[PDB]
Amino acid sequence: PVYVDFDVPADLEDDALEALEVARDTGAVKKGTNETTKSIERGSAELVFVAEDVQPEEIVMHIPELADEKGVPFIFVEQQDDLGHAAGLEVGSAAAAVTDAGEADADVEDIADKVEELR
């Protein structure tokens, strides 16, 4: 909520999580806020995901400002458990990162372009 500056539509979120499911079975993904943060700093992150139901908000707070100065695109997911299942975990995830997509590079590029049109 405090780190959220734009609302992402349910349709765009469906596209995003589907692209993440095929990113783990082909390319490579980073699961968890610590690994997502290191990906943005190292530059290896292509697209970063962030949950909106994170309590406390401090865990994720830095991602929207850190990604802006590193050129890495970010998208908001409504639920924590949906992002965790999409990353391939039994538990939830506050943040996920796509470190070089696989056979979804065209979809990821479009998601990154649809988010910029939504500010």
Partner RNA sequence: CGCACGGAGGCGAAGAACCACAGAUUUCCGAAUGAGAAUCUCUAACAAUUGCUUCGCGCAAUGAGGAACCCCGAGAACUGAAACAUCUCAGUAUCGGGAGGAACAGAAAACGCAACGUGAUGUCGUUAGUAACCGCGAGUGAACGCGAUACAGCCCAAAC
Partner RNA sequence: ACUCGUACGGUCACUGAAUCCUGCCCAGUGCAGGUAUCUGAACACCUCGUACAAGAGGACGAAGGACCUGUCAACGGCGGG
Partner RNA sequence: GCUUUACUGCAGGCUGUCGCUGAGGACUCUCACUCCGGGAGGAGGACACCGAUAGCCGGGCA
Q: Name the site residues for another protein (rule: CB under 8 A).
A: 2-3, 33-34, 36-38, 41-42, 55-59, 61-62, 66
In 3D space, the residue among 96, 85, 103 whose CA is nearest the CA of residue 47 turns out to be 96
Nearer to another protein, 26 or 34 (CB): 34
Give Cα 117 distance to the centre of its chain.
17
DSSP annotation of 118 reads: T
Alpha carbon separation from 85 to 17, 62, 73, 80 (Å, rounded): 9, 23, 21, 9
Residues 74-103 touching Sr ion, rule: CB under 5 A, are 92
Q: C-beta of 115: minimal distance to another protein in Å?
A: 20
DSSP annotation of 9 reads: P
Q: Draw the binding track, 8-37, toward RNA (x: CB under 7 A; -: no contact).
A: --------------------------x---
Q: C-beta of 33: minimal distance to Sr ion in Å?
A: 13
